[PDB]
Amino acid sequence: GSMASACEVVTGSPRGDSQSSWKSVGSQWASPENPCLINECVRVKEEVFIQQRNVSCPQLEVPVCPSGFQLSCKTSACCPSCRCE
């Protein structure tokens, strides 16, 4: 068969600074080389591949908080995210 239950993640600079490591399906991470996107290793019946999907983040609209809050735009990944402090 030679069928995988894990994906081989190898991403890095062309110099050979790429880190190849196996992630079991169900693993998600952000694209390091590119802008930010969520690479979701999916197992579809007997097919196992990396699904290139975009990052999940909230709307840029201001969350409902009482006057006297501090709007804090702060996110870990490439997306819009502002919370009320």
Nearest-angstrom CA–CA distance, 23 and 59: 30
Nearest-angstrom CA–CA distance, 50 and 18: 17
Nearest-angstrom CA–CA distance, 30 and 55: 8
Taking CA atoms, 43 is separated from 1, 7, 26, in Å, by: 15, 9, 8
Nearest-angstrom CA–CA distance, 62 and 59: 8
Residue-range domain boundaries for the chain: 1-85
**Structure method:** NMR
Q: Is 34 exposed, middle or buried (0-12, 13-18, 19+ CB in 10 A)?
A: exposed
SS3 letters for 14-79?
CCCCCEEEEEECCCEEECCCCCCEEEEEEEECCEEEEEEEECCCCCCCCCCCCCCCCEEECCCCCC
